[PDB]
Design a protein around this ligand. Structure first.
Ligand SMILES: NC(=O)c1ccc[n+]([C@@H]2O[C@H](COP(=O)([O-])OP(=O)(O)OC[C@H]3O[C@@H](n4cnc5c(N)ncnc54)[C@H](O)[C@@H]3O)[C@@H](O)[C@H]2O)c1
Ligand SMILES: NC(=O)c1ccc[n+]([C@@H]2O[C@H](COP(=O)([O-])OP(=O)(O)OC[C@H]3O[C@@H](n4cnc5c(N)ncnc54)[C@H](O)[C@@H]3O)[C@@H](O)[C@H]2O)c1
Ligand SMILES: CC(=O)N[C@H]1[C@@H](OP(=O)(O)OP(=O)(O)OC[C@H]2O[C@@H](n3ccc(=O)[nH]c3=O)[C@H](O)[C@@H]2O)O[C@H](CO)[C@H](O)[C@@H]1O
Ligand SMILES: CC(=O)N[C@H]1[C@@H](OP(=O)(O)OP(=O)(O)OC[C@H]2O[C@@H](n3ccc(=O)[nH]c3=O)[C@H](O)[C@@H]2O)O[C@H](CO)[C@H](O)[C@@H]1O
Lengths: 336, 336
């Protein structure tokens, strides 16, 4: 069990608060929405359906009662517009800021669009929240922020030079957050996600992350490409661990705020092994090419999550094999 | 003698190039305009007359030949618009990016707009230049990036935490720049100015810099305010030194690109001493109160300019007293 997490969720049910989820129509945002409505929370969602999907909201609506669903207010809109951000902040207690453009390659082909959404939009949401004086502000940061820094495992204090325009944006979020605390006293929590996966992670289009991409390729019978030697490694973190950290963060005591936390499992998996993992799990459910390293790619990534453990009482409970067993049926269904 | 600068300038005159100056109606941009046209360069100018002035363009036109002036194309427009940045990039060899909203206090009261001009506009200009395959790209960075770092003097590798949104913006300009060399092989020079002063630094405005502010204050018999105990200390940099460094950076040897340079004189003057220096200097042309420290003001600032002296053959020629001597009659002219 996850017990400070199980305490808090109980508390939420007994006295529901008002949550803003930006990027509510995406992977992590729709999983947050699914958990929060199942706890009877009031939830304001904001999304421009850029990379998200109206069908992600349709699926969540099939997972909760009509009464629970009636507590969700959705605004179609864009974090780049400050007014929009001020409007959705009205009466919000806790901010979970997930809206961003992901993908390192997307950011290399088009750094401008990546900047607008991840810096302008990020600062817009942050400033509006500062001004509405919400109770908490938790935002999606990134393991890419570790950069060319070689030390292993990854510890919050120790970062490198960013390796791509995407990594620049997610780092700038931490800097803006820390200057906002210093200048205004508005104390936030940044969450350095490491390679999140699970249900509703988009398998389509050029920018799919490796798990839904390879899972889909193997189901279709498409080539599976490993960019590089395949010893590149990641801390693959199943969605429920991320859902836990967001909620622990929103209800954190003040002293644990103005802090950055690695969100992961402490494990290390190469693309070669992963490929074995995806194939094996899929196969119990029933039904490869090497090429160049990808540009601006981080080489080795393994979180040290002692800090989240000690300070937020995080329990990292689902590891990659189990996470994948939980994920694959959603994929098989979704794709056929 | 500024021997390398001399030789670089003889190169330009025999083989004129096309330059873009953003921020060209402003203090530093109009001073770069003056020199470059004096070298018979072709110059494209961009400005939105936010902090800049048409009267600065009017003065430059009195200072250069008609033949020289004919090679200046002024375009009013805004670096926040990409299409505009792409347009003025056409046939550009050397990029001098000065357009931004300065002032630390302005960034604390309006972090949104500063971000747009100073992060969005900066990325817009940098991306257009990469795309147009210009020969060089030199941009205005800031000594405010040293932040809370205690060590004196300031050397480029050692910075601390930014104290203002403004410092965040200039620091992000450096990170984007280094990510462009890494990702696109597009090599930039970032210049961290330390408190530049000279002809055409604006004395009017709630955000006027200390030297034009105090000069105007003293001439009107108005109150001179010290924000602090007066022991706040700076490396005050007369404008010609900055002009020398932009020109040396634009024709830098390749190995000296993808680098950040302090741009000062290496001296240290407290606010208490400056007030006496201005007064004495003014007093030869014949005509204090303490309040609170200013929020997120850097305490103490002295540049180590060894890396410029070494890598670029920068030769700073004008220190504070002489630079005040040269500037004082400009201000008497302006305000009369
Ligand atoms: N998936 C991961 O491994 C991972 C890793 C590190 C960081 N992150 C970060 O997690 C956050 C969410 O990622 P995700 O995996 O859920 O991606 P996603 O693309 O599935 O979700 C992003 C959501 O934000 C929305 N969005 C984008 N720009 C917007 C804008 N300008 N206005 C309003 N909505 C906008 C998209 O429509 C989408 O619904 C992002 O901040 C991302 O950088 C994810
Ligand atoms: N004053 C200093 O000592 C110092 C120190 C470090 C960095 N800098 C930087 O030096 C550069 C120039 O500063 P300055 O002292 O010349 O200030 P300034 O305000 O006199 O000049 C800046 C110019 O940029 C123009 N501008 C601003 N935003 C624009 C936009 N969106 N579109 C088009 N034009 C725009 C303004 O109209 C102005 O003419 C800036 O990057 C500033 O941040 C200055
Ligand atoms: C360690 C790190 O920086 N992680 C960040 C980075 O994820 P990654 O860029 O690491 O996410 P990803 O799933 O896109 O790639 C993982 C790895 O698998 C490789 N690959 C991918 C597809 C393929 O067909 N074949 C293949 O080999 C890819 O080159 C990379 O080495 O960006 C994400 C947002 O987008 C998150 O911010 C992550 O925190
Ligand atoms: C050390 C530092 O970070 N310098 C940067 C900072 O300059 P500064 O903000 O230091 O420039 P400034 O002239 O505005 O301020 C100079 C100093 O004088 C003080 N003061 C100012 C006005 C007054 O009426 N009385 C008074 O005492 C002020 O509080 C500060 O301590 O920002 C600039 C852009 O805006 C440049 O980036 C400089 O590189």
């Amino acid at each position: 069990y996850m017990s400070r997490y199980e305490e808090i969720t109980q508390q939420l049910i007994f006295s529901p608060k008002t949550w803003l989820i930006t990027g509510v129509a995406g992977f992590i945002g729709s999983n947050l929405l699914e958990k929060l409505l199942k706890l009877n929370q009031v939830v304001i969602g904001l999304d421009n359906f850029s990379t998200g999907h109206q069908y992600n909201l349709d699926e969540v609506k099939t997972l909760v009662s009509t009464e629970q669903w009636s507590r969700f207010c959705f605004i179609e809109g864009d974090i780049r517009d400050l007014t929009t951000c001020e409007q959705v902040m009205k009466g919000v207690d806790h901010v979970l800021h997930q809206a961003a453009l992901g993908s390192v390659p997307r950011s290399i082909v088009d750094p401008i669009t990546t900047n607008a959404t991840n810096i302008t939009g990020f600062l817009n949401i942050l400033h509006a929240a500062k001004n509405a004086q919400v109770q908490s502000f938790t935002y999606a940061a990134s393991s890419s922020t570790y950069g060319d820094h070689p030390a292993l495992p990854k510890v919050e204090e120790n970062i490198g030079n960013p390796l791509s325009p995407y990594a620049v944006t997610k780092y700038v979020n931490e800097i803006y957050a820390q200057v906002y605390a210093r200048t205004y006293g508005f104390k936030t929590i940044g969450l350095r996600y490491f390679n999140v996966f699970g249900r509703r992670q988009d398998p389509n289009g050029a920018y799919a992350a490796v798990i839904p991409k390879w899972t889909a390729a193997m189901l279709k019978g498409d080539d599976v490409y490993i960019n590089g030697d395949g010893e590149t490694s990641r801390d693959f973190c199943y969605i429920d661990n991320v859902i836990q950290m967001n909620i622990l963060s929103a209800l954190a005591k003040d002293s644990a705020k103005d802090n950055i936390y690695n969100v992961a499992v402490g494990d290390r998996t190469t693309l070669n092994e992963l490929s074995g993992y995806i194939y094996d799990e899929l196969n119990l459910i029933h039904h490869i090419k090497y090429r160049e390293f990808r540009s601006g790619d981080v080489r080795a990534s393994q979180a040290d999550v002692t800090k989240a453990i000690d300070l937020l009482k995080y329990r990292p409970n689902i590891k990659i094999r189990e996470g994948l067993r939980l994920s694959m049926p959603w994929y098989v269904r979704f794709l056929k």
